[PDB]
Write a protein that binds this ligand. Structure first.
Ligand SMILES: [Zn+2]
Ligand SMILES: [Zn+2]
Lengths: 117, 98
């Protein structure tokens, strides 16, 4: 489905707003401070995830691997480069529903690969 | 951290905090913060050696004291909100391989 996103006008750089073309039945975006119009490519407008199953692998930063206060195991090798050190931690996120799942971040410089088991 | 342990540009009182997950870095020179000294650990060894303790043992008439201990980078003042980024060992015992 997609979580969609904003679009900005190209003249006054304001927020475009979705509106309906009544003649051609084509979704348009129009700034309200000028006459600028643009055709909607995505065709979805407002999308809301209530169940909100969230992918934490997107939020996790690779720099986390430098923290002394996080644990690490040589049990789980890196999936990409096959490095033994992995520094694992939990959600660290409020409103996570119920997750004790560990997320893994590969140590060694610049790898930064982030997986979940 | 290296300039604070030599006390060149930065008084030992300034505290500095690298928060990784939110990407901030904070440097507080402000007055009122509360900080207590700690030994420093580089790799698995304390930076307090025996030669430091022999000089303090004789501290009388050496003109060699705490400030000369802090100025060698062996001890460090660490306030609270910088204790969130630190790993402390209770005693040198925890440093040895268990
Ligand atoms: Zn506009
Ligand atoms: Zn790796």
């Amino acid at each position: 489905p997609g979580i969609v996103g904003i679009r900005f006008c190209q003249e006054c750089n304001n927020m475009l707003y979705p509106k309906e073309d009544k003649e051609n039945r084509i979704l348009l975006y129009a700034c309200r401070n000028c006459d600028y119009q643009q055709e909607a490519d995505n065709s979805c407008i407002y999308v809301n995830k209530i169940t909100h199953e969230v992918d934490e692998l997107t939020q996790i930063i690779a720099d986390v691997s430098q923290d002394p206060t996080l644990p690490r195991t040589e049990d789980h090798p890196c999936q990409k480069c096959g490095h033994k050190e992995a520094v694992f931690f939990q959600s660290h996120s409020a409103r996570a529903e119920d997750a004790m799942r560990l997320y893994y971040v590969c140590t060694a410089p610049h790898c930064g690969h982030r997986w979940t088991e | 951290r290296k300039l604070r342990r030599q006390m060149d540009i930065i008084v030992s009182e300034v505290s500095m905090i690298r928060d990784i997950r939110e990407r901030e870095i904070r440097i507080y020179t402000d007055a009122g913060r509360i900080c207590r000294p700690l030994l420093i650990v580089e790799k698995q060894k304390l930076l307090l050696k025996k030669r430091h303790i022999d000089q303090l043992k004789e501290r009388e008439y050496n003109n060699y004291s705490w400030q000369d201990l802090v100025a060698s980078g062996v001890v460090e003042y660490i306030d609270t909100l910088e204790e969130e980024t630190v790993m402390l060992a209770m005693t040198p015992d925890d440093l040895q391989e268990k």
